[PDB]
């Protein structure tokens, strides 16, 4: 277990995907042409997790870029790190998916999926020992959502003993493209519950509110939202990418974070919260990091941690700091809040440290929580689904592609089951 294969689908998927590669390439010393120009050995020791080595001697992301429309991917190609991607790994159709999960999953996506799997296969064949896959996508559109979940199901069929991991962007009325987002998200959640091992719930509601309430940006763009996403994504993958005292992979993450196979939707958090441009000079103390990383206002999923309990938590501290003081503060916050951590999983809070801080910071903390409070996210989507679905509003966009209302009823029931399955462990 060395190689991860990365897939990015649709507009959101490709935009957050491109930003992730910009950030991690910078962290690993890699420049737009693929050349290493860094000064630490820690940068290269585990670089094979994400990068292929061409005889070059160039580093090529193990990344496949997928869309049903060309626009966003042309934008990736002419973007900052655009030239670094293997040009054969751009797989795109022409028609788009019209924010329609049925188009992505059943009609338009079906037409393109085999050629994506061909590219997946070529990368997988070149792997010493493939860990599994990470997908970036949103759940509210058509391609990332319908076609992304189609890909996952086809990847699982061909590689049933590999790990599937997603970064899944949840829609919010606060940052909304179409009214059909809750339909697309519910259909997609149904898929994620069955076919991923671990999913980071990146909630556009939370990203918006952080940008507005905390970063004091009166009118957040997608760019501002994505600044938070890429910082979080860098953070959560630190222990996959860098050598440390705990050497992690996608399977060990899943084993230790997921006590029941359906409850695999993580609430990520980050501290210190910053924006692009105006950044703080004031350094953070270990007690301040720890306090901030656990604050509701630092979570990337709009749920109140106090309305539930943590099943498991992984925490990663980056920068030169006292590991002794880290351990003390982490233990302090558990011992002073222990009603919020289930008592039937001993040692359910795990901390790891990496010396390399992210760009522009002296120290940072990244949070990965499996909390029963995530049920709030799913309940919110469920309410929005039902508000339309009770009158069958907007359904003709889906029945026109050959779907039946039964399939909506089934995906709704499965998502409601998930919610009450969370409620079950919040009491005991």
């Amino acid at each position: 277990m060395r190689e991860i294969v990365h897939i990015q689908a649709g507009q959101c998927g490709n935009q957050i995907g491109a930003k992730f590669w910009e950030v991690i390439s910078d962290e690993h010393g890699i420049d737009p042409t693929g050349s290493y120009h860094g000064d630490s050995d820690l940068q290269l020791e585990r670089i094979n997790v994400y990068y292929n080595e061409a005889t070059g001697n160039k580093y090529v992301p193990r990344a496949i870029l997928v869309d049903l429309e060309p626009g966003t991917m042309d934008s990736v190609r002419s973007g900052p790190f655009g030239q670094i991607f293997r040009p054969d790994n751009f797989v795109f159709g022409q028609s788009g998916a019209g924010n329609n999960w049925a188009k992505g999953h059943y009609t338009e996506g079906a037409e393109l999926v085999d050629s994506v799997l061909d590219v997946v296969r070529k990368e997988s064949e070149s792997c010493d020992c493939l860990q599994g896959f990470q997908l970036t996508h949103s759940l509210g559109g058509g391609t990332g959502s319908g076609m992304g979940t189609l890909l996952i199901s086809k990847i699982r069929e061909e590689y049933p003993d590999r790990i599937m991991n997603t970064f899944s962007v949840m829609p919010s009325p606060k940052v909304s493209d179409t009214v059909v987002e809750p339909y697309n998200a519910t259909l997609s959640v149904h898929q994620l519950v069955e076919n991923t091992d671990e999913t980071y719930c990146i909630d556009n509601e939370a990203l918006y509110d952080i940008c507005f309430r905390t970063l004091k940006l009166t009118t957040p763009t997608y760019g501002d939202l994505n600044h938070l996403v890429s910082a979080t994504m860098s953070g959560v993958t630190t222990c996959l990418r860098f050598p440390g005292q705990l050497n992690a992979d996608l399977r060990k993450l899943a084993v230790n974070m997921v006590p029941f196979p359906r409850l695999h939707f993580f609430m990520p958090g980050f501290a210190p919260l910053t924006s692009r441009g105006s950044q703080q000079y004031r350094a953070l103390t270990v007690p301040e990091l720890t306090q901030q990383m656990f604050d509701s206002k630092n979570m990337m999923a709009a749920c109140d941690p106090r309305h539930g309990r943590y099943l498991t938590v992984a925490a990663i501290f980056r920068g030169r700091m006292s590991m002794k003081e880290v351990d003390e503060q982490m233990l302090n916050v558990q011992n002073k809040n222990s009603s919020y951590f289930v008592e039937w999983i001993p040692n359910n809070v795990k901390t790891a440290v990496c010396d390399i801080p992210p760009r522009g910071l002296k120290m940072s903390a990244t949070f990965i929580g499996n909390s029963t409070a995530i049920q709030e996210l799913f309940k919110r989507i469920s309410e929005q689904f039902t508000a339309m679905f009770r009158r069958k509003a907007f359904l003709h966009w889906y029945t026109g592609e050959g779907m039946d209302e039964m399939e909506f009823t089934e995906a709704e029931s499965n998502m409601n089951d998930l919610v009450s399955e969370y409620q079950q462990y919040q009491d005991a």
């Binding site: 009609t107 199901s153 026109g400 592609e401 050959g402």
Partner: protein, 67 residues
Amino acid sequence: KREHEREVIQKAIEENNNFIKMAKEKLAQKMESNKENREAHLAAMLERLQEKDKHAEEVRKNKELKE
């Protein structure tokens, strides 16, 4: 699941084809029924005028058969 996926796309094709088919036939029945109706309207008009030519033959007969 692959079976279901096949059935969805096939349902989509079928409903689309049915729509095209129903549209083609409804239009053919309307254009035929219309052509017939218009023809019958004109045929009736011509028959009325034919009776006027027949009645005028009777009038010119009636004048001569006064002698």
